[PDB]
Copies of this chain bind each other. A is one copy, B any other.
Amino acid sequence: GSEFMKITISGTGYVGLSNGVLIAQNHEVVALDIVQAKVDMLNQKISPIVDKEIQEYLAEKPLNFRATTDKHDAYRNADYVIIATPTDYDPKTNYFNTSTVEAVIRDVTEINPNAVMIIKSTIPVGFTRDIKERLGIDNVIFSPEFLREGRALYDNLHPSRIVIGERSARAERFADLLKEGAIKQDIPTLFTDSTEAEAIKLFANTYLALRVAYFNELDSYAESQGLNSKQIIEGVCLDPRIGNHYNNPSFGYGGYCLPKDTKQLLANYESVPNNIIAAIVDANRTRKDFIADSILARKPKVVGVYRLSSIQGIMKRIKAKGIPVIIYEPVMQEDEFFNSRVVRDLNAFKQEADVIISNRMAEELADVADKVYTRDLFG
């Protein structure tokens, strides 16, 4: 009887907490965290992370939810344990650090070997099949998370889809828990085998990077041929097989996931003949070179950056010519960024900057649009 289940969350970042609040609406949830201070705020119904819906739900809804720093208390009697501890992939060494996930698997296997673990942390392709065989256990299943930090609970209440990397009754029972707490009805739900589930996000994220890189190359062509990029892009994207989003020219795809995931996938293609996977990584370098070359042809003595991640690679190329960069970014409280000077006064910024670069056009820049370079079209 799923109605009487206990679900434990191990890791209280946005993924763990989102899943915990979602499920606690209808079931008993216990969140384990190593930091006593976070357990205290949670038990006082205060969210330790910035997320509107999570704070609203914890303070205003009757959730059968509590936290603890105690492992035995957290895991015992758990039907499912959702693992959402920190992990990190480093492209330079091709090293994926999964130590927090393996430590949790260790603890649960010792404390409650009957619990079914659902890993939501990001792990390498093949991780789950491998750890099951290494430890001689079977109670571990991977399920990707498609949440955006800052709208994590919102995304679990309105998910694109639910994917559980096991084809069985207990996987179907866990998918039911996720849909029961959701606001969206009829959520597409897919059951796959293990390694296939772990590859979905890399292929999905790499496709998005590909799309951005493609529209960026279309933009490189338009600039070099003196054409209106927006006219071409809008005409192309009115084809419904292509669609009209994720098509805004930029200085390169960036953010915390695409650069790393594209490289992670390329590393997984080590012995698979391919041209597109490798080109998606190379394309971003080529685009930043093009953007930097276009700015440098203007012969600036100083380049100003209006607001602050691909623009960092543009800064790097400019500073390699001995050209200083000044930055205007109020959100930044630092004195410098990658050694370059943050300027608080906006009117001095416009005066000194021979070329102002930005991933978005802006109202205040109108007066100096003649020296503003942005390829943004739809921001």
Contact = CB atoms under 8 A, between A and B. Distances in A.
Given A227-B195, A228-B193, A160 B239 contact: yes
Contact of A273 (B268, B277, B289): B289
Contacts of A283: 274-276
Nearest to A220: B272
A132 B162 CA distance: 56
Contacts of A161: 235, 238-239
A283 to B, nearest CB: 4
Contacts of A9: none
The dominant DSSP class at the A interface is helix
> Considering the complex of A and B, which 9 residue pairs feature the smallest CB-CB distances, nearest first?
A279-B279, A192-B231, A161-B238, A196-B231, A200-B235, A275-B283, A275-B282, A275-B279, A204-B236
Interface stretch (A86-94, A241-249, A348-356): A241-249
Interface of A: 144, 146, 160-161, 163, 188, 190, 192-193, 195-197, 199-200, 203-204, 207-208, 210, 213-214, 217-218, 220-221, 224-225, 227-228, 231-232, 234-236, 238-243, 245-246, 268-269, 271-280, 282-283, 286, 289-290
Copies in the complex: 2
Nearest to A226: B195
Contact of A190 (B210, B235, B242, B290): B235
B224 A272 contact: yes
Contacts of A193: 227-228, 231
Given A188-B238, A196-B232, 5 more contacts: A160-B238, A163-B235, A208-B241, A221-B269, A224-B271
Given A192-B235, A214-B210, A275 B268 contact: no
A190 B232 CA distance: 10
7 contacts: A193-B227, A196-B228, A207-B214, A213-B275, A220-B274, A241-B245, A275-B286
